[PDB]
Structure 1
Amino acid sequence: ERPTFYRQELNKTIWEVPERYQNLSPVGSSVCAAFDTKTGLRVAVKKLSRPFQSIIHAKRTYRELRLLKHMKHENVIGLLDVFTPARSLEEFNDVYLVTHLMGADLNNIVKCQKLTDDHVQFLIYQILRGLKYIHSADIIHRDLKPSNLAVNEDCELKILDFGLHTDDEMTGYVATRWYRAPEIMLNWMHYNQTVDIWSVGCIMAELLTGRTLFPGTDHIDQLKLILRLVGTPGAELLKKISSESARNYIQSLTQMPKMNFANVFIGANPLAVDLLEKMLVLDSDKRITAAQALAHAYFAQYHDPDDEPVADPYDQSFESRDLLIDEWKSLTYDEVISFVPPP
């Protein structure tokens, strides 16, 4: 049955959460840290802003809830709890999500400086293990980056924000665009799962060197940095770019050959370099997958084929379905009500 709910103003809104959650303190984007007296765990509790203000919001709310309920994996943010203080569907208008409070994002550990090769192995291994599970369910993260990768004190890693930016926040000299596969940055085509492997490659590079790999001052500048490294596209890839405007623009660019990665990442483990060359491939059909990357020699100390699970089938037929706000709300309510907390 329904626990007692208390109220509290925190992020300029009043948070009505069950009594078990105490010592709520804001931590950013809205999310609060709290202590779960019921489990003894420190938790992150997320309140969604106007979940059913439009069709899009209602759908996105349902999407998020659906994604987090499905995901059960060490390297993927999992749901400890979801609640609403509403007793009926008629009163339903607030959704709260609960997970582990994580110590630090990847940005905070990197801190301009380099990391040891063993550290980089463990961290990239965990992202890839997470990604393989996510991808096995035909879910793409689409926005992998250091601030989306959260870590504990033993350097155990979870992926956040999978499967879920405006026009201006993607503009200029911003970490929001630096990890984006050029196909999706420039809308070249219907994009596949390997957009995420491009992001891993960006992240891995930064971990080895302590520096951003493609720190573009804008979309076009970032593209130039990318083609400098990996070379301009050949005939086969140009055909695959569906946007004619985009195809025509690349075809304006002076041809450049792929660089020597050994000479770019001086001093780095040659297995790292090799792996990097397979991730940072312009044509997305030819990029290495998370499954294949996990069997690469670079991870020989961590790789265990029987300890790298795939996800249960994910039904996302809802994605191409047009419902009314009320209908999205009703679906979301059923998912809240039916949730079963993990052991």
Structure 2
Amino acid sequence: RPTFYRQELNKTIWEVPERYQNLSPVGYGSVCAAFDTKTGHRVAVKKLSRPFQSIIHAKRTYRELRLLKHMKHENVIGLLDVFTPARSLEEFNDVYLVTHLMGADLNNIVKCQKLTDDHVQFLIYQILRGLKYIHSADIIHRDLKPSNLAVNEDCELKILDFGLHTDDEMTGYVATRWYRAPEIMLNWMHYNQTVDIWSVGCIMAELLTGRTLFPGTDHIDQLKLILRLVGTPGAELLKKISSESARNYIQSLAQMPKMNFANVFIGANPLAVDLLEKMLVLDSDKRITAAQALAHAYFAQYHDPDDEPVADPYDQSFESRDLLIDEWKSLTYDEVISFVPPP
């Protein structure tokens, strides 16, 4: 067990191993930047806030730690370390997570740069490479958007901040909803991993035009923007919407055909237009998958089917388990103490 040292930074006590130096606040928890003297990396250290205050919160803490421990891929955030100052389960209260410190996100590039078509190819390729890996473990990200994509000076990209949101966070003119698939925005049906491909379509469109694709001022305004582009649903999709009320509302709207995407994404690579038409499909059964998209001709310069790995199997059966707070806490403690760092 390492030696820990204590300090107070912005009204919070931080107790961390000596290897982490020069802690400096930066931002579910509080976050500091630090220098990891064991690896030489600049890191983010996150101290969870009240990780075990309720059954819901204790299960959420376990879910986050299980997910971060599993993710081992070049285009996905990984876990560098996890620690607690507690010396036994009986005194276990605090959990700290350590990841690589991320600089700019895709917003700090989309808003503040000039992107060639080659940049768009490389950025979207990496998102899809990470998503092929995530989806192969039957994990759904659910919250893909530019602020959850880290990008460095060399255009290298990592997916972070998995969906692990409130009614109010999704209300109004807010980026937290602009990238969401319509079937989850309006609770049309049980969703699956196809929702992430809708989000990639929204992101790719924005890289090509420099503008948000569907910046709705509320749920209904956003739906109207979506249906104007991709057309109103036919009877085949309407059958799949479980809410009689949602079905009723959709049928109240005048019917519209799918638009010509070459006349929307003016001047874009025709192969980019084609791929957008295959991602931004209203019926989620018919969207292209991540594995299929990697083989699309838009990515011919980067696609390598021998360098696009899948994930180890991921057991999520705990999600249907009904446990007490102390049982979730004990499960989390076991995962902290069994952590093995990466090479």
**Same fold by TM (over 0.5)?**
yes
For residue 24 of structure 2, give the secondary structure of its aligned residue in structure 1.
strand
Q: 5+ residue gaps in structure 2? A: none
Contact residue 271 and residue 297 of structure 1 kept, 8 A: yes
Q: 1:289 to 1:11 in 2, by over 3 A?
A: farther
Contact residue 139 and residue 163 of structure 1 kept, 8 A: no
Distance in 1 (CA, whole Å) between partners of 2:165 and 2:153 is 30
Quick one: percent identity of the two aligned structures? 99
1:152 Cα deviation after fit? 1.9
For residue 175 of structure 2, give the secondary structure of its aligned residue in structure 1.
coil
Which TM-score applies when normalising by structure 2?
A: 0.98
Q: Deviations over 1:16-52 (max 9, x none)?
A: 1111111112222722111001111101111111110
Q: 1:113 to 1:258 in 2, by over 3 A?
A: farther
For residue 150 of structure 2, give the secondary structure of its aligned residue in structure 1.
strand
1:15 Cα deviation after fit? 1.3
Distance in 1 (CA, whole Å) between partners of 2:15 and 2:314 is 31
Distance in 1 (CA, whole Å) between partners of 2:128 and 2:117 is 16
1:108 Cα deviation after fit? 0.9
Distance in 2 (CA, whole Å) between partners of 1:44 and 1:218 is 34
1:62 Cα deviation after fit? 0.3
Contact residue 114 and residue 210 of structure 1 kept, 8 A: no
Distance in 1 (CA, whole Å) between partners of 2:285 and 2:148 is 25
Contact residue 112 and residue 211 of structure 1 kept, 8 A: no
Deviates more, 1:312-321 or 1:110-119: 110-119
Q: Which residue does the alignment assign to 2:30?
A: 30
Q: Which residue does the alignment assign to 2:72?
A: 72
Q: Which residue does the alignment assign to 2:16?
A: 17
Distance in 2 (CA, whole Å) between partners of 1:27 and 1:150 is 16
Contact residue 10 and residue 26 of structure 1 kept, 8 A: yes
Q: 1:247 to 1:96 in 2, by over 3 A?
A: same
1:153 Cα deviation after fit? 1.9
Distance in 2 (CA, whole Å) between partners of 1:184 and 1:89 is 39
Distance in 1 (CA, whole Å) between partners of 2:199 and 2:13 is 37
1:254 Cα deviation after fit? 0.9
1:249 aligns with 2:280: no
1:114 Cα deviation after fit? 4.6
Distance in 2 (CA, whole Å) between partners of 1:277 and 1:251 is 24
* Matches for 1:295-334 after TM superposition, within 5 Å: 295-334=295-334
Contact residue 172 and residue 218 of structure 1 kept, 8 A: yes
For residue 64 of structure 1, give the secondary structure of its aligned residue in structure 2.
helix
Deviates more, 1:328-337 or 1:5-14: 5-14
Contact residue 114 and residue 208 of structure 1 kept, 8 A: no
Distance in 2 (CA, whole Å) between partners of 1:156 and 1:12 is 36
Distance in 1 (CA, whole Å) between partners of 2:323 and 2:106 is 38
How large is the Cα RMSD of the aligned pairs?
1.0
1:8 Cα deviation after fit? 2.1
Contact residue 21 and residue 36 of structure 1 kept, 8 A: yes
1:12 Cα deviation after fit? 3.0
Deviates more, 1:65-74 or 1:162-171: 162-171
Q: Deviations over 1:107-162 (max 9, x none)?
A: 11111665111111110000000000000000000111001001122111111122
Distance in 1 (CA, whole Å) between partners of 2:31 and 2:115 is 29
Which TM-score applies when normalising by structure 1?
A: 0.98
Q: 1:70 to 1:134 in 2, by over 3 A?
A: same
1:163 Cα deviation after fit? 4.1
Contact residue 45 and residue 97 of structure 1 kept, 8 A: yes
Deviates more, 1:244-253 or 1:268-277: 244-253
Q: Deviations over 1:233-263 (max 9, x none)?
A: 0000000001111111111111110000000
Q: 1:253 to 1:114 in 2, by over 3 A?
A: farther
Q: Deviations over 1:77-98 (max 9, x none)?
A: 0011000001101111111111
1:10 Cα deviation after fit? 2.5
Distance in 2 (CA, whole Å) between partners of 1:208 and 1:11 is 41
* Matches for 1:1-343 after TM superposition, within 5 Å: 2-28=1-27, 30-111=30-111, 114-343=114-343
Distance in 2 (CA, whole Å) between partners of 1:167 and 1:16 is 35
1:169 Cα deviation after fit? 1.2
Distance in 2 (CA, whole Å) between partners of 1:10 and 1:270 is 53
Count of aligned residue pairs for this structure pair: 342
